[PDB]
Amino acid sequence: ANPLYQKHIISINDLSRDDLNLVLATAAKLKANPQPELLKHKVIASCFFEASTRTRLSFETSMHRLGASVVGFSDSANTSLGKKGETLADTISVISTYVDAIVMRHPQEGAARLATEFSGNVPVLNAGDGSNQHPTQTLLDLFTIQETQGRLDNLHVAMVGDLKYGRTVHSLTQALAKFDGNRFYFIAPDALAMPQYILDMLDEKGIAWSLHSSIEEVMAEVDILYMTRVQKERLDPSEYANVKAQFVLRASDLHNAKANMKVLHPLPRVDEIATDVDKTPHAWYFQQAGNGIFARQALLALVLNRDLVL
Amino acid sequence: ANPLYQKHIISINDLSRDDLNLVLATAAKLKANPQPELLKHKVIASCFFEASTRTRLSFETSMHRLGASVVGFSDSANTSLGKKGETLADTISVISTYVDAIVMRHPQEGAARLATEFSGNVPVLNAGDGSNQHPTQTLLDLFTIQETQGRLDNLHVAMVGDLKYGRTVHSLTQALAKFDGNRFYFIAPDALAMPQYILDMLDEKGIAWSLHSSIEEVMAEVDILYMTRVQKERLDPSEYANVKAQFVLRASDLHNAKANMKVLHPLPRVDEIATDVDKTPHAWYFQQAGNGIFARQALLALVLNRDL
Amino acid sequence: ANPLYQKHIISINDLSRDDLNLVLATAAKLKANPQPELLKHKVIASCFFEASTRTRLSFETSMHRLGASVVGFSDSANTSLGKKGETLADTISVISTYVDAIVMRHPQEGAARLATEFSGNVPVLNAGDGSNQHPTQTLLDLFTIQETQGRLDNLHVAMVGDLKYGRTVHSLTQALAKFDGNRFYFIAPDALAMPQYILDMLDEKGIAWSLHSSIEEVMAEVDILYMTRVQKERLDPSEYANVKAQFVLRASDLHNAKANMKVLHPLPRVDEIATDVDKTPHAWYFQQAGNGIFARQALLALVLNRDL
Numbered sequence: 001a002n003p004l005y006q007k008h009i010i011s012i013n014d015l016s017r018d019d020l021n022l023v024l025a026t027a028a029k030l031k032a033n034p035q036p037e038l039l040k041h042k043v044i045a046s047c048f049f050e051a052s053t054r055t056r057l058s059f060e061t062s063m064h065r066l067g068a069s070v071v072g073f074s075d076s077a078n079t080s081l082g083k084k085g086e087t088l089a090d091t092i093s094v095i096s097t098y099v100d101a102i103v104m105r106h107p108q109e110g111a112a113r114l115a116t117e118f119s120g121n122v123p124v125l126n127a128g129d130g131s132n133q134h135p136t137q138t139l140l141d142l143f144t145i146q147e148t149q150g151r152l153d154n155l156h157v158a159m160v161g162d163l164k165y166g167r168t169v170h171s172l173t174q175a176l177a178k179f180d181g182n183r184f185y186f187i188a189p190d191a192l193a194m195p196q197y198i199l200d201m202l203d204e205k206g207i208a209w210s211l212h213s214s215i216e217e218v219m220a221e222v223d224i225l226y227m228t229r230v231q232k233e234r235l236d237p238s239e240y241a242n243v244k245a246q247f248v249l250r251a252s253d254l255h256n257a258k259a260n261m262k263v264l265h266p267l268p269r270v271d272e273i274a275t276d277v278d279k280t281p282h283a284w285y286f287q288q289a290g291n292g293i294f295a296r297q298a299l300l301a302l303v304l305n306r307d308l309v310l
Numbered sequence: 311a312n313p314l315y316q317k318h319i320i321s322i323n324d325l326s327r328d329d330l331n332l333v334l335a336t337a338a339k340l341k342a343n344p345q346p347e348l349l350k351h352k353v354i355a356s357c358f359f360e361a362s363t364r365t366r367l368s369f370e371t372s373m374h375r376l377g378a379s380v381v382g383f384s385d386s387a388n389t390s391l392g393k394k395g396e397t398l399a400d401t402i403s404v405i406s407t408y409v410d411a412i413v414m415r416h417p418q419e420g421a422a423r424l425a426t427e428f429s430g431n432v433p434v435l436n437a438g439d440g441s442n443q444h445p446t447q448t449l450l451d452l453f454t455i456q457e458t459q460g461r462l463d464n465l466h467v468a469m470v471g472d473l474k475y476g477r478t479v480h481s482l483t484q485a486l487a488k489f490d491g492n493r494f495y496f497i498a499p500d501a502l503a504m505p506q507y508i509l510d511m512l513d514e515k516g517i518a519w520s521l522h523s524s525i526e527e528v529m530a531e532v533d534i535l536y537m538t539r540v541q542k543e544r545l546d547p548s549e550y551a552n553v554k555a556q557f558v559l560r561a562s563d564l565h566n567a568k569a570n571m572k573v574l575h576p577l578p579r580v581d582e583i584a585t586d587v588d589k590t591p592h593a594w595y596f597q598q599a600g601n602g603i604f605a606r607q608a609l610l611a612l613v614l615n616r617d618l
Numbered sequence: 619a620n621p622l623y624q625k626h627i628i629s630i631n632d633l634s635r636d637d638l639n640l641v642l643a644t645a646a647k648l649k650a651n652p653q654p655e656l657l658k659h660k661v662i663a664s665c666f667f668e669a670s671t672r673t674r675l676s677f678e679t680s681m682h683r684l685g686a687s688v689v690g691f692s693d694s695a696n697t698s699l700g701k702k703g704e705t706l707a708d709t710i711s712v713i714s715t716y717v718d719a720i721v722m723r724h725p726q727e728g729a730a731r732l733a734t735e736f737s738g739n740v741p742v743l744n745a746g747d748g749s750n751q752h753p754t755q756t757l758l759d760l761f762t763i764q765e766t767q768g769r770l771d772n773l774h775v776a777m778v779g780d781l782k783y784g785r786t787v788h789s790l791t792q793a794l795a796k797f798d799g800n801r802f803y804f805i806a807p808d809a810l811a812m813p814q815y816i817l818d819m820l821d822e823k824g825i826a827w828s829l830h831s832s833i834e835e836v837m838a839e840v841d842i843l844y845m846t847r848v849q850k851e852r853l854d855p856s857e858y859a860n861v862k863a864q865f866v867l868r869a870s871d872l873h874n875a876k877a878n879m880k881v882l883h884p885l886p887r888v889d890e891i892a893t894d895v896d897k898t899p900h901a902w903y904f905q906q907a908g909n910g911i912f913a914r915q916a917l918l919a920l921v922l923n924r925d926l
């Protein structure tokens with residue numbers, strides 16, 4: 001049976017290693033051979049309460065590539081919530097009477113989990129809830145790491161930049177921690193460090209990690225260098241001094257990288273990755289974004305179709 | 311047969327009891343047996359000039375469930391009317407060369423009727439025109455009453471809140487008055503009473519109505535309690551003291567309700583229906599909203615297809 | 619595959635007379651006999667960074683009429699470029715991993731050509747780049763001239779209004795100069811005259827053109843009277859005195875028109891065409907806009923389908 005059928009997809013913490021492997025296997029099959037009528041007769045809501053380029057466009061393209069239709073909004077200003085004072089709860093309660101699943105991105109932490117209390121039998125998929133979780137970004141990142149490295153175990157992974165507000169690294173560290181032998185290098189300003197709740201989970205599973213003040217000091221050891229943007233729009237006033245990127249990666253900084261190493265970045269970037277890195281063999285952030293199509297199609301098919309494909 | 315084929319749907323005042331009943335019968339069949347390719351090859355415009363959550367999203371979902379495609383906008387800011395100075399008449403004249411029907415909501419009363427002067431042979435469906443009419447809200451409201459009450463005649467119905475600017479109750483009161491023996495109770499602030507042209511219509515048809523100062527006093531006799539939001543964005547500045555809801559429905563008010571009674575609301579609500587009512591068996595505003603899918607699929611099918 | 623398969627469509631200056639005839643013949647075949655599954659399985663991006671009613675809505679409709687799906691935005695405010703500081707180049711690099719083609723309108727001249735540097739194998743179709751080019755407006759304008767005049771050669775064509783900033787007339791003059799024996803009349807304020815680079819091209823081909831101070835001077839000879847809007851959003855405030863239309867067309871000015879003459883306007887219009895013109899048989903601006911459906915379906919079919 002399909003373990004993800006009709007399930008809410010809110011946090012990586014709720015998913016098992018086996019569930020992650022199932023999405024990846026389903027993504028490889030659909031990347032090889034499309035299923036243009038799999039979700040014919042399904043209508044999906046796409047509801048974005050804060051800005052997006054890749055996550056909204058890739059999700060909607062995936063819906064069309066499976067034959068489903070889409071309704072929704074990319075801003076809340078002209079909804080009833082935006083002009084007539086409606087609650088978020090009431091908005092989910094009526095939208096659940098129209099569609100087969102709801103994709104939602106929202107600026108407040110916990111908003112996706114709150115929507116599950118009001119959606120009845122319709123599954124809710126978290127496209128990002130403030131600085132907390134981003135589970136579909138992690139699905140595509142795992143697919144990408146697997147594709148370039150050949151495995152998801154025994155890897156050296158560095159995460160750089162704003163780790164405190166990075167919903168992308170919270171989800172990706174929790175998922176890489178379900179596999180065996182992975183090790184982490186965290187390179188961030190003291191003010192934007194990886195939160196203690198993530199570190200405590202690593203400690204409880206016996207996973208190695210360390211803190212660094214430069215990229216160059218561990219460059220020779222990493223398989224995946226995962227760069228991030230400072231989350232300007234989430235910063236508290238006590239962190240305004242941290243708005244500019246602290247680490248800036250240049251092509252010349254790649255002298256000592258392993259030949260197999262790849263540079264990833266959930267995007268968008270500001271100046272933390274210079275454009276001269278774009279032409280090197282290590283740049284893989286645009287390929288990573290292209291993999292969002294296969295991961296999000298796999299998640300949609302698993303949540304809305306009873307039977308596994310194959 | 312099909313008397314609604316290619317008709318503009320602007321006002322309840324223009325439809326007959328038989329026209330209402332055909333839309334309801336068609337909605338019931340489509341709910342029981344869907345027809346996913348009924349409007350394949352159609353392209354419909356969805357043109358919203360003011361805010362919406364239920365009406366726009368339900369209409370677009372209904373079009374996709376019948377196999378049609380949709381184009382349009384949810385705000386006029388980025389159109390040529392919004393930035394290059396184009397008139398509404400010219401906007402309608404060009405969109406009419408592209409699509410098979412136009413769904414339009416607009417802040418000004420009369421704007422949907424105005425669109426029919428420029429759309430040519432393309433049907434215009436009014437999704438709300440200022441505080442005047444809201445005919446597809448009435449079609450889903452009638453479908454809900456009929457499903458919960460088992461009939462549309464000889465009912466006791468109360469309408470509470472902003473009846474002056476409520477496009478929803480103007481349309482619903484006109485449609486219920488086409489059926490026999492209904493009785494109405496209106497519970498509103500003095501500044502936002504039901505308009506005189508609606509009361510004159512009821513008096514001409516011999517339909518009884520009365521004015522009340524609370525929800526409690528009519529609770530034992532009503533079959534349908536229809537709650538409404540204060541239309542804050544339509545109020546005149548001289549009426550700004552009426553922004554907070556005057557009447558609030560709470561679960562304990564339902565203590566002497568009739569077993570069959572249902573609480574409706576076109577939505578969205580502010581505080582006029584407390585959230586403790588949602589769990590009671592009388593709450594039916596979310597089911598009512600879900601019924602917009604069947605009523606709006608039925609209207610689209612009848613206007614766009616020659617045969618029933 | 620055909621000669622336009624997988625090509626970027628940025629400028630008329632890059633297309634041949636044979637490329638233009640191909641689109642026109644495909645447009646006629648699709649108008650006479652639709653192919654609603656032709657682009658089944660194609661997903662196209664529609665990325666508008668400045669306002670539009672006609673170009674975006676007719677392009678999306680054309681996509682649906684051939685079975686394709688569409689994703690995108692009608693403004694950039696809620697994209698990552700709009701709120702997180704993303705560059706336009708990174709925006710095209712990622713959208714090109716999702717779709718089969720990209721339709722783009724942008725306020726900066728040369729922006730569509732820049733996008734072809736980052737889109738890899740994905741075709742970019744320019745829906746307007748500042749005051750520079752507008753190649754799909756020219757394709758529907760050619761289609762319209764052919765349908766009403768029976769040909770695209772031996773015509774007298776007058777272009778009135780803002781010729782300096784009108785992207786429409788830069789593209790159309792370049793295209794009509796690829797056919798035979800046409801003669802042009804340019805009627806514009808001196809501050810907004812046809813640019814020199816266009817006039818030099820005509821001279822190099824031996825094409826006859828002249829400048830006129832009134833519409834009455836050439837009314838008796840024209841086959842096509844192409845009216846234009848002053849491009850307010852492109853002017854410098856020092857040129858603000860030219861905002862009001864210098865030339866207003868009225869139904870009374872058509873008394874000595876040829877019986878075949880048609881008045882065209884890419885739209886929207888502000889004050890340059892009075893509404894009394896609309897009911898004359900010479901008015902053809904709404905019919906021209908309807909022809910964007912056939913011209914845009916044809917171009918999408920040739921760019922995305924290998925066979926004919």
Ligand SMILES: O=C(O)C[C@H](NC(=O)CP(=O)(O)O)C(=O)O
Pocket residue numbers: 051052053054055056128134137167168228229266267268698702
């Ligand atoms: O915004 C970031 O820096 C990373 C991440 N980015 C994305 O999801 C891509 P987008 O915002 O374009 O959908 C996010 O958390 O929103």
Ligand SMILES: O=C(O)C[C@H](NC(=O)CP(=O)(O)O)C(=O)O
Pocket residue numbers: 080084361362363364365366438444447477478538539576577578
């Ligand atoms: O706004 C109201 O209170 C009643 C009614 N509401 C609706 O139609 C629901 P919505 O605005 O979400 O489409 C309306 O007249 O617009």
Ligand SMILES: O=C(O)C[C@H](NC(=O)CP(=O)(O)O)C(=O)O
Pocket residue numbers: 390394669670671672673674746752755785786846847884885886
């Ligand atoms: O704007 C004009 O006056 C002419 C021309 N107009 C159009 O293309 C029509 P629209 O802006 O509605 O797509 C343009 O250059 O954008």
Ligand SMILES: [Ca+2]
Pocket residue numbers: 320321423442443
């Ligand atoms: Ca009316």
Ligand SMILES: [Ca+2]
Pocket residue numbers: 771798
């Ligand atoms: Ca010839």
